[PDB]
Amino acid sequence: MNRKQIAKGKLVRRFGINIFEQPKYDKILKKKPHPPGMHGKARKAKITEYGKQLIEKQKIKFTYGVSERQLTNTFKEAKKHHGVTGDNLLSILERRIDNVVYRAGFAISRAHARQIVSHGIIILNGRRVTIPSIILRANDQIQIKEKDSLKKLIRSNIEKTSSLRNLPTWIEVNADDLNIKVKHAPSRDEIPTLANEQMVVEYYSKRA
Amino acid sequence: RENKKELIGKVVSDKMSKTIVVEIVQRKMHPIYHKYLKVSKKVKAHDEKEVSKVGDKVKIIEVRPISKDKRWSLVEVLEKLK
Amino acid sequence: MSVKIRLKRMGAKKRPYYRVVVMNSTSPRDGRAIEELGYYHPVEKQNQIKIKEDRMKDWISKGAILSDTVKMLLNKNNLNAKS
Amino acid sequence: MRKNASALKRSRQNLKRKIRNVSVKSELKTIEKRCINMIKAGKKDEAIEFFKFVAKKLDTAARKRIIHKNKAARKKSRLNVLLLK
RNA sequence: GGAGGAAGGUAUUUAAGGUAUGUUUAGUGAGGGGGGUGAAGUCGUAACAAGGUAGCCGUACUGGAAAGUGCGGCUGGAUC
RNA sequence: AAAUAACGAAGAGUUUGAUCCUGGCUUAGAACUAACGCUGGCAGUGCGUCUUAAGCAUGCAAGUCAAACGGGAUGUAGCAAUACAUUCAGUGGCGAACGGGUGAGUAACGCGUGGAUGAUCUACCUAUGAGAUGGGGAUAACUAUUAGAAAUAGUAGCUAAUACCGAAUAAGGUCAGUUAAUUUGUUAAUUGAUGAAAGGAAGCCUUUAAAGCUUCGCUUGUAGAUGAGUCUGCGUCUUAUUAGCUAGUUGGUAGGGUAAAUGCCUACCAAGGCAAUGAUAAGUAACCGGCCUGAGAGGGUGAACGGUCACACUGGAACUGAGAUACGGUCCAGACUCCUACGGGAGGCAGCAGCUAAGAAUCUUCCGCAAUGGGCGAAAGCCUGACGGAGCGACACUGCGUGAAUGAAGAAGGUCGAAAGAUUGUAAAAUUCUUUUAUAAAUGAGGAAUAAGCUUUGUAGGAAAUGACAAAGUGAUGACGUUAAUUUAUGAAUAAGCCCCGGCUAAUUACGUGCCAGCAGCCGCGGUAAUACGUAAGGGGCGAGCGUUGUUCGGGAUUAUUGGGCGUAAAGGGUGAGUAGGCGGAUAUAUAAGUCUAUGCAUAAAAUACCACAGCUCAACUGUGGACCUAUGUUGGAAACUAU
């Protein structure tokens, strides 16, 4: 995650939508609507269908901060089940542990939650885990490490994020114990929408 | 005695001694088009009694080798050519 | 050959698993299995032993030779089944 | 390559056993030959006696596993059948 | 004295080697033959219009060359 | 409106002044045991001479039994013997036919799968019926000696054994007759002929021997299990510009030989046998479970792993042995290498590492037998380059990090401009927070089971201990390893590049070059204003990787069974008569080869492939279950259609 050279203002500008849900990026959109580069104001020729599919794929990929190739594996796993492939894909992506922390509000951004989970702070179902690509299942627990500095850090984070964001109905958050409980896999309607998931599915159908 | 395989065929040669040649036709799959193909395979068979002659339909059984090629024995004559 | 009941190794580096198996002495450690009898998972904390008692008894009667490890697996499985 | 004491010893034992084996085998061949020749001579009674002797030799060797007991049995069959004639 | 036991001799079969004749296949070979690209060089103007002798097919003969002509066949032939 | 099922199929450029169709080429994707170029942090798992089956320095990879036997040497007791213990070689037992490597050869019962073996064998293992009574002769080792540089062969004398060879009786042996069954050489009974043998350690006590007894063994016999030989139905590459081939060739009668059938081999008797329904020949190739690709059908392919086969320098041959036509056994011939005292000898890394040569191209001359497996032994124990691990290579696969949160109408520079300003850009700077990784320390599971030995209980046995078995407890032992994981200590500290931007194909402007220099997969760009060349600024893609090349599939319905055509695009034979073959009116009955069904019942080893559930911090990876196809065999049915 060397994402120092992928300054996200450029991405939010090209997509024309705040895919990270951060007010600074809302402000950047307000200030400079045009796409990046010197030709940002220059009239752009019409985009091919391949371009639209790519735009949606990149929206999802940069929203969830997952390597494209890992996302390919995710789609290949989602397709293995019956049902709405887009729903399975979105559910698998959403149940990522760093994403779960972000939803619960224990972190500011998905990158922040990724660092938190990578730095060995999160405790999974009674054990320490250090990587952000865990796909939680139903009936699982996040605890916070037994260190006072970390506990105060998480409380500062949650007091910040509580106002800005909301708190999904498939997560049970207990700010007193710093406990997170995942009830069931999310439904499509209870997942915020930022891209056309079946355009993503169509894009990955080509890779066959 | 139990599962020795039996074959039914047409005697195509008799000018041997104590031996006949049986031409057997096997129906077989074609792996692709599924239509059958009639395959003609010729085997030698032991005929101790010179019972059978050219043109008739006989039945033969698997036995121990009796010669280099002869590995079948006569069991019965299903149809005798008049 | 001298039919023996032994452990055929499976699994990855530093995480062995064994299959309780019936197979000839001369046959390599991971070759043809005349029959399978169960599994033995030493790196697991639970369900470490599971063998087919009747089949193993039948093979012993036929004349198989138990390695020491499979012999004690049979003993320990008897103990845990009774318990 | 490196001379194995096992291999050298096995070669020595090979010669040792070969001498004894081949001696017994030649015994069998010649005794059998005398027997069939006076079967041909028709000397029924000492053909009897010599068949007794040769059968003794045959299955003595078979017990010693110099030759297979099936070989001994085959020789006895055929030779006794010829005397039956 | 069997034991012809065991060496030795003899004989059959046989590897390698030698000889002879055909046979499969890969390089090379004076010279010769056509093919392609580079030539937009030389000679002629055969085909595309009725291409200026309508065209073409099979066969035969002939000519620096495209080709010409005889016989039969076709329209996939203007014009009337 | 609806129900159910289906869980899965994308295009584009290019013939023309322009158009439609036909048609080839090219292209976006997924892969490989890959190589090369730029760049390069770590961890896990897997992989790593595809070419010269070319030649090989060196070390190791198969030994074990002293409780089978006679001796030598040593220490102790001993005067000497003899004992106790250690050690050496010899005789002998078992193993060495397993494990390991390679794919040269082999279009073949070799391989896959189902069977046949009344034509078969089978040491060690399990159960079990009977037994084990008495003699004799050599021989190594050893002591000398002959030939010899050594390798080594001999010679003479002495000695034992679970070594070798007779003898007495035999229990389910073999052979032959007879009878009884069974109907290829099967079984049972009778007679006749005829076949054996090994004892060593321990305890016991009549002093003891004796006598019986424990364990490991020996002779004979059967049964089971396992493996192997042989045969067979079916499947198993290309070229018919390979058309005739075979003369032990085809079959018969005897015989040779084999565990066993057969021209497997030999002697005679016939001329037969195979072949356009593809014989024979040439070329290529180990096969299969599988792998890659694909919606599927198919196509390509046979890395790793597992099974079978073949080979171990080239070409033969036999011996020992239950088992070999024997990788590190023997003999011979040939080439090559090496040592000679010139008489002659020694050697085969396609075992684990490693060297040279070849090649675009591939590793350490490492640790350990702790676990698993194997060999020997009563056991302790020994051996195990199998295997457990480590090191090396971004070679593939999987995961993680290189920061995170605030942060300006917006720093300097760079670039575009009319020199308002834009863009790089909240990016940086700055502030705050965190420590996966980095370093240090502490803590630290699990792979491990116990073995010998010891304690105790119970069973068989018996006069009884020693011992055997069943059970309980005690009982040394980790190469990996500074293990996985966990807890503190310091701080943004240790960490990004590569390709592309005319269309295909997501991404444009400014300079320099002027049909030169160059790009290119296709169409094609460059001749004085190049979004296509070269360099900068921006933008897109992926990321410790990114591109290129080689090979396979897909897009290609471009070999079309699913699913294409033949008037003019490539494609109807000049025409007819007919052989083989394919196909064919109506209707009745029977057979059940095809077809369908009970997705009966089995077989299709394991792994892999699909679906769930689990364990490695997750994933890869690993494990336990559950199935979907369709392939063969078989059982009982249905009969319309094809077939009889």
PDB file of N, CA, C and O (backbone and C1' of nucleotides) in Angstrom, chain D residues 12, chain F residues 66 69-72 88-92 138-145 152-161:
ATOM      1  N   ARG D  12      31.466 -64.838  -3.716  1.00  0.00           N
ATOM      2  CA  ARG D  12      32.093 -66.071  -3.253  1.00  0.00           C
ATOM      3  C   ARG D  12      31.046 -67.142  -2.990  1.00  0.00           C
ATOM      4  O   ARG D  12      31.162 -68.281  -3.463  1.00  0.00           O
TER       5      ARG D  12
ATOM      6  P     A F  66      24.851 -58.909  17.669  1.00  0.00           P
ATOM      7  O5'   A F  66      25.969 -60.036  17.558  1.00  0.00           O
ATOM      8  C5'   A F  66      25.666 -61.395  17.849  1.00  0.00           C
ATOM      9  C4'   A F  66      26.769 -62.066  18.631  1.00  0.00           C
ATOM     10  C3'   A F  66      27.160 -61.377  19.936  1.00  0.00           C
ATOM     11  O3'   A F  66      27.517 -62.359  20.908  1.00  0.00           O
ATOM     12  C1'   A F  66      29.042 -61.498  18.509  1.00  0.00           C
ATOM     13  P     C F  69      26.786 -70.120  18.648  1.00  0.00           P
ATOM     14  O5'   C F  69      27.938 -70.721  17.731  1.00  0.00           O
ATOM     15  C5'   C F  69      27.895 -72.073  17.300  1.00  0.00           C
ATOM     16  C4'   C F  69      28.971 -72.366  16.286  1.00  0.00           C
ATOM     17  C3'   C F  69      30.386 -72.006  16.702  1.00  0.00           C
ATOM     18  O3'   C F  69      30.980 -72.981  17.540  1.00  0.00           O
ATOM     19  C1'   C F  69      29.984 -71.206  14.519  1.00  0.00           C
ATOM     20  P     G F  70      31.925 -72.532  18.759  1.00  0.00           P
ATOM     21  O5'   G F  70      33.397 -72.647  18.167  1.00  0.00           O
ATOM     22  C5'   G F  70      33.858 -73.869  17.612  1.00  0.00           C
ATOM     23  C4'   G F  70      34.872 -73.636  16.522  1.00  0.00           C
ATOM     24  C3'   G F  70      36.137 -72.902  16.930  1.00  0.00           C
ATOM     25  O3'   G F  70      37.086 -73.743  17.560  1.00  0.00           O
ATOM     26  C1'   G F  70      35.293 -71.959  14.940  1.00  0.00           C
ATOM     27  P     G F  71      38.189 -73.114  18.544  1.00  0.00           P
ATOM     28  O5'   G F  71      39.132 -72.282  17.570  1.00  0.00           O
ATOM     29  C5'   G F  71      39.799 -71.115  18.020  1.00  0.00           C
ATOM     30  C4'   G F  71      40.311 -70.295  16.864  1.00  0.00           C
ATOM     31  C3'   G F  71      41.095 -69.048  17.233  1.00  0.00           C
ATOM     32  O3'   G F  71      42.443 -69.326  17.568  1.00  0.00           O
ATOM     33  C1'   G F  71      39.504 -68.508  15.577  1.00  0.00           C
ATOM     34  P     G F  72      43.140 -68.565  18.797  1.00  0.00           P
ATOM     35  O5'   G F  72      43.619 -67.184  18.166  1.00  0.00           O
ATOM     36  C5'   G F  72      44.443 -67.162  17.010  1.00  0.00           C
ATOM     37  C4'   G F  72      44.541 -65.775  16.430  1.00  0.00           C
ATOM     38  C3'   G F  72      44.802 -64.657  17.425  1.00  0.00           C
ATOM     39  O3'   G F  72      46.167 -64.550  17.793  1.00  0.00           O
ATOM     40  C1'   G F  72      43.046 -64.025  15.986  1.00  0.00           C
ATOM     41  P     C F  88      35.051 -53.982  15.039  1.00  0.00           P
ATOM     42  O5'   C F  88      36.117 -54.909  14.306  1.00  0.00           O
ATOM     43  C5'   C F  88      37.355 -54.377  13.859  1.00  0.00           C
ATOM     44  C4'   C F  88      38.284 -55.461  13.372  1.00  0.00           C
ATOM     45  C3'   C F  88      37.697 -56.441  12.370  1.00  0.00           C
ATOM     46  O3'   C F  88      37.651 -55.931  11.049  1.00  0.00           O
ATOM     47  C1'   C F  88      38.866 -57.632  14.037  1.00  0.00           C
ATOM     48  P     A F  89      36.314 -56.092  10.172  1.00  0.00           P
ATOM     49  O5'   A F  89      36.528 -57.463   9.390  1.00  0.00           O
ATOM     50  C5'   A F  89      37.536 -57.581   8.398  1.00  0.00           C
ATOM     51  C4'   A F  89      38.124 -58.969   8.357  1.00  0.00           C
ATOM     52  C3'   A F  89      37.202 -60.080   7.887  1.00  0.00           C
ATOM     53  O3'   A F  89      37.073 -60.141   6.478  1.00  0.00           O
ATOM     54  C1'   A F  89      38.338 -60.774   9.834  1.00  0.00           C
ATOM     55  P     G F  90      35.738 -60.740   5.814  1.00  0.00           P
ATOM     56  O5'   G F  90      35.843 -62.308   6.073  1.00  0.00           O
ATOM     57  C5'   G F  90      36.886 -63.077   5.490  1.00  0.00           C
ATOM     58  C4'   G F  90      36.903 -64.488   6.021  1.00  0.00           C
ATOM     59  C3'   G F  90      35.604 -65.265   5.890  1.00  0.00           C
ATOM     60  O3'   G F  90      35.411 -65.812   4.598  1.00  0.00           O
ATOM     61  C1'   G F  90      36.456 -65.526   8.074  1.00  0.00           C
ATOM     62  P     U F  91      33.943 -65.859   3.953  1.00  0.00           P
ATOM     63  O5'   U F  91      33.251 -67.105   4.665  1.00  0.00           O
ATOM     64  C5'   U F  91      33.744 -68.420   4.473  1.00  0.00           C
ATOM     65  C4'   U F  91      33.024 -69.413   5.348  1.00  0.00           C
ATOM     66  C3'   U F  91      31.508 -69.374   5.290  1.00  0.00           C
ATOM     67  O3'   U F  91      30.969 -70.049   4.165  1.00  0.00           O
ATOM     68  C1'   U F  91      32.198 -69.430   7.540  1.00  0.00           C
ATOM     69  P     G F  92      29.781 -69.380   3.317  1.00  0.00           P
ATOM     70  O5'   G F  92      28.556 -69.340   4.335  1.00  0.00           O
ATOM     71  C5'   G F  92      27.995 -70.539   4.842  1.00  0.00           C
ATOM     72  C4'   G F  92      27.072 -70.279   6.007  1.00  0.00           C
ATOM     73  C3'   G F  92      25.903 -69.351   5.744  1.00  0.00           C
ATOM     74  O3'   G F  92      24.825 -69.986   5.079  1.00  0.00           O
ATOM     75  C1'   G F  92      26.936 -68.754   7.779  1.00  0.00           C
ATOM     76  P     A F 138      37.535 -86.119   5.291  1.00  0.00           P
ATOM     77  O5'   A F 138      37.437 -85.121   4.054  1.00  0.00           O
ATOM     78  C5'   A F 138      37.930 -83.794   4.143  1.00  0.00           C
ATOM     79  C4'   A F 138      37.037 -82.831   3.405  1.00  0.00           C
ATOM     80  C3'   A F 138      37.423 -81.364   3.494  1.00  0.00           C
ATOM     81  O3'   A F 138      38.449 -81.009   2.586  1.00  0.00           O
ATOM     82  C1'   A F 138      35.113 -81.595   3.919  1.00  0.00           C
ATOM     83  P     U F 139      39.676 -80.095   3.072  1.00  0.00           P
ATOM     84  O5'   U F 139      39.068 -78.624   3.109  1.00  0.00           O
ATOM     85  C5'   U F 139      38.426 -78.071   1.970  1.00  0.00           C
ATOM     86  C4'   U F 139      37.498 -76.948   2.355  1.00  0.00           C
ATOM     87  C3'   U F 139      38.121 -75.823   3.163  1.00  0.00           C
ATOM     88  O3'   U F 139      38.812 -74.884   2.360  1.00  0.00           O
ATOM     89  C1'   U F 139      36.096 -76.487   4.175  1.00  0.00           C
ATOM     90  P     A F 140      40.416 -74.828   2.379  1.00  0.00           P
ATOM     91  O5'   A F 140      40.743 -73.271   2.317  1.00  0.00           O
ATOM     92  C5'   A F 140      40.710 -72.469   3.488  1.00  0.00           C
ATOM     93  C4'   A F 140      39.479 -71.600   3.535  1.00  0.00           C
ATOM     94  C3'   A F 140      39.600 -70.327   4.355  1.00  0.00           C
ATOM     95  O3'   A F 140      40.232 -69.274   3.649  1.00  0.00           O
ATOM     96  C1'   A F 140      37.606 -71.441   4.939  1.00  0.00           C
ATOM     97  P     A F 141      41.645 -68.699   4.149  1.00  0.00           P
ATOM     98  O5'   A F 141      41.336 -68.132   5.605  1.00  0.00           O
ATOM     99  C5'   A F 141      40.411 -67.076   5.797  1.00  0.00           C
ATOM    100  C4'   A F 141      39.968 -66.984   7.235  1.00  0.00           C
ATOM    101  C3'   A F 141      41.079 -66.918   8.269  1.00  0.00           C
ATOM    102  O3'   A F 141      41.630 -65.622   8.415  1.00  0.00           O
ATOM    103  C1'   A F 141      39.486 -68.518   8.943  1.00  0.00           C
ATOM    104  P     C F 142      43.212 -65.394   8.255  1.00  0.00           P
ATOM    105  O5'   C F 142      43.862 -66.489   9.213  1.00  0.00           O
ATOM    106  C5'   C F 142      43.734 -66.394  10.624  1.00  0.00           C
ATOM    107  C4'   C F 142      44.288 -67.616  11.312  1.00  0.00           C
ATOM    108  C3'   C F 142      45.715 -67.993  10.951  1.00  0.00           C
ATOM    109  O3'   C F 142      46.682 -67.222  11.643  1.00  0.00           O
ATOM    110  C1'   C F 142      44.353 -69.920  10.882  1.00  0.00           C
ATOM    111  P     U F 143      48.010 -66.731  10.888  1.00  0.00           P
ATOM    112  O5'   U F 143      48.880 -68.057  10.743  1.00  0.00           O
ATOM    113  C5'   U F 143      49.291 -68.786  11.890  1.00  0.00           C
ATOM    114  C4'   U F 143      50.037 -70.038  11.507  1.00  0.00           C
ATOM    115  C3'   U F 143      51.093 -69.875  10.428  1.00  0.00           C
ATOM    116  O3'   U F 143      52.313 -69.353  10.924  1.00  0.00           O
ATOM    117  C1'   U F 143      49.762 -71.766   9.946  1.00  0.00           C
ATOM    118  P     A F 144      53.231 -68.426   9.987  1.00  0.00           P
ATOM    119  O5'   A F 144      54.188 -69.462   9.252  1.00  0.00           O
ATOM    120  C5'   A F 144      54.588 -69.261   7.907  1.00  0.00           C
ATOM    121  C4'   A F 144      54.676 -70.569   7.161  1.00  0.00           C
ATOM    122  C3'   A F 144      55.059 -70.474   5.694  1.00  0.00           C
ATOM    123  O3'   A F 144      56.455 -70.337   5.500  1.00  0.00           O
ATOM    124  C1'   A F 144      53.195 -71.901   5.924  1.00  0.00           C
ATOM    125  P     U F 145      57.023 -69.242   4.470  1.00  0.00           P
ATOM    126  O5'   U F 145      56.811 -69.915   3.042  1.00  0.00           O
ATOM    127  C5'   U F 145      57.333 -71.204   2.761  1.00  0.00           C
ATOM    128  C4'   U F 145      56.636 -71.835   1.583  1.00  0.00           C
ATOM    129  C3'   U F 145      56.577 -70.993   0.320  1.00  0.00           C
ATOM    130  O3'   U F 145      57.775 -71.038  -0.435  1.00  0.00           O
ATOM    131  C1'   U F 145      54.440 -71.888   0.762  1.00  0.00           C
ATOM    132  P     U F 152      41.733 -57.858  -5.321  1.00  0.00           P
ATOM    133  O5'   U F 152      42.751 -59.032  -4.978  1.00  0.00           O
ATOM    134  C5'   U F 152      42.454 -60.378  -5.313  1.00  0.00           C
ATOM    135  C4'   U F 152      43.222 -60.827  -6.530  1.00  0.00           C
ATOM    136  C3'   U F 152      43.246 -62.323  -6.789  1.00  0.00           C
ATOM    137  O3'   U F 152      42.074 -62.784  -7.437  1.00  0.00           O
ATOM    138  C1'   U F 152      45.432 -61.449  -6.999  1.00  0.00           C
ATOM    139  P     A F 153      41.213 -63.982  -6.800  1.00  0.00           P
ATOM    140  O5'   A F 153      41.113 -65.047  -7.976  1.00  0.00           O
ATOM    141  C5'   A F 153      41.461 -66.405  -7.759  1.00  0.00           C
ATOM    142  C4'   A F 153      42.674 -66.797  -8.565  1.00  0.00           C
ATOM    143  C3'   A F 153      43.262 -68.164  -8.254  1.00  0.00           C
ATOM    144  O3'   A F 153      42.577 -69.218  -8.909  1.00  0.00           O
ATOM    145  C1'   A F 153      44.994 -66.557  -8.318  1.00  0.00           C
ATOM    146  P     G F 154      41.622 -70.208  -8.079  1.00  0.00           P
ATOM    147  O5'   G F 154      42.545 -71.471  -7.776  1.00  0.00           O
ATOM    148  C5'   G F 154      43.495 -71.442  -6.721  1.00  0.00           C
ATOM    149  C4'   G F 154      44.851 -71.912  -7.183  1.00  0.00           C
ATOM    150  C3'   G F 154      45.462 -73.054  -6.387  1.00  0.00           C
ATOM    151  O3'   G F 154      44.975 -74.327  -6.781  1.00  0.00           O
ATOM    152  C1'   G F 154      47.064 -71.348  -6.652  1.00  0.00           C
ATOM    153  P     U F 155      44.595 -75.425  -5.672  1.00  0.00           P
ATOM    154  O5'   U F 155      45.989 -75.780  -4.986  1.00  0.00           O
ATOM    155  C5'   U F 155      47.022 -76.420  -5.720  1.00  0.00           C
ATOM    156  C4'   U F 155      48.260 -76.607  -4.884  1.00  0.00           C
ATOM    157  C3'   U F 155      48.055 -77.266  -3.529  1.00  0.00           C
ATOM    158  O3'   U F 155      47.954 -78.677  -3.606  1.00  0.00           O
ATOM    159  C1'   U F 155      49.412 -75.353  -3.272  1.00  0.00           C
ATOM    160  P     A F 156      46.959 -79.466  -2.625  1.00  0.00           P
ATOM    161  O5'   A F 156      47.783 -79.606  -1.269  1.00  0.00           O
ATOM    162  C5'   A F 156      48.980 -80.366  -1.223  1.00  0.00           C
ATOM    163  C4'   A F 156      49.722 -80.158   0.073  1.00  0.00           C
ATOM    164  C3'   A F 156      48.905 -80.314   1.345  1.00  0.00           C
ATOM    165  O3'   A F 156      48.711 -81.666   1.721  1.00  0.00           O
ATOM    166  C1'   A F 156      50.200 -78.349   1.485  1.00  0.00           C
ATOM    167  P     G F 157      47.375 -82.102   2.499  1.00  0.00           P
ATOM    168  O5'   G F 157      47.603 -81.568   3.983  1.00  0.00           O
ATOM    169  C5'   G F 157      48.631 -82.110   4.799  1.00  0.00           C
ATOM    170  C4'   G F 157      48.677 -81.445   6.151  1.00  0.00           C
ATOM    171  C3'   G F 157      47.341 -81.263   6.854  1.00  0.00           C
ATOM    172  O3'   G F 157      46.883 -82.441   7.494  1.00  0.00           O
ATOM    173  C1'   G F 157      48.569 -79.253   6.973  1.00  0.00           C
ATOM    174  P     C F 158      45.308 -82.699   7.675  1.00  0.00           P
ATOM    175  O5'   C F 158      44.909 -81.779   8.913  1.00  0.00           O
ATOM    176  C5'   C F 158      45.519 -81.964  10.182  1.00  0.00           C
ATOM    177  C4'   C F 158      45.159 -80.857  11.140  1.00  0.00           C
ATOM    178  C3'   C F 158      43.676 -80.572  11.306  1.00  0.00           C
ATOM    179  O3'   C F 158      43.029 -81.481  12.177  1.00  0.00           O
ATOM    180  C1'   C F 158      44.840 -78.537  11.025  1.00  0.00           C
ATOM    181  P     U F 159      41.498 -81.887  11.923  1.00  0.00           P
ATOM    182  O5'   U F 159      40.678 -80.615  12.418  1.00  0.00           O
ATOM    183  C5'   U F 159      40.713 -80.214  13.778  1.00  0.00           C
ATOM    184  C4'   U F 159      39.798 -79.045  14.036  1.00  0.00           C
ATOM    185  C3'   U F 159      38.427 -79.113  13.387  1.00  0.00           C
ATOM    186  O3'   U F 159      37.518 -79.935  14.099  1.00  0.00           O
ATOM    187  C1'   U F 159      39.355 -76.967  13.047  1.00  0.00           C
ATOM    188  P     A F 160      36.245 -80.565  13.352  1.00  0.00           P
ATOM    189  O5'   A F 160      35.055 -79.571  13.723  1.00  0.00           O
ATOM    190  C5'   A F 160      34.755 -79.274  15.077  1.00  0.00           C
ATOM    191  C4'   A F 160      33.928 -78.021  15.202  1.00  0.00           C
ATOM    192  C3'   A F 160      32.589 -78.024  14.484  1.00  0.00           C
ATOM    193  O3'   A F 160      31.579 -78.707  15.207  1.00  0.00           O
ATOM    194  C1'   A F 160      33.715 -75.992  14.055  1.00  0.00           C
ATOM    195  P     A F 161      30.348 -79.386  14.431  1.00  0.00           P
ATOM    196  O5'   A F 161      29.332 -78.183  14.194  1.00  0.00           O
ATOM    197  C5'   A F 161      28.801 -77.450  15.287  1.00  0.00           C
ATOM    198  C4'   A F 161      28.243 -76.122  14.842  1.00  0.00           C
ATOM    199  C3'   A F 161      27.165 -76.178  13.773  1.00  0.00           C
ATOM    200  O3'   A F 161      25.880 -76.454  14.304  1.00  0.00           O
ATOM    201  C1'   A F 161      28.781 -74.564  13.175  1.00  0.00           C
TER     202        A F 161
END
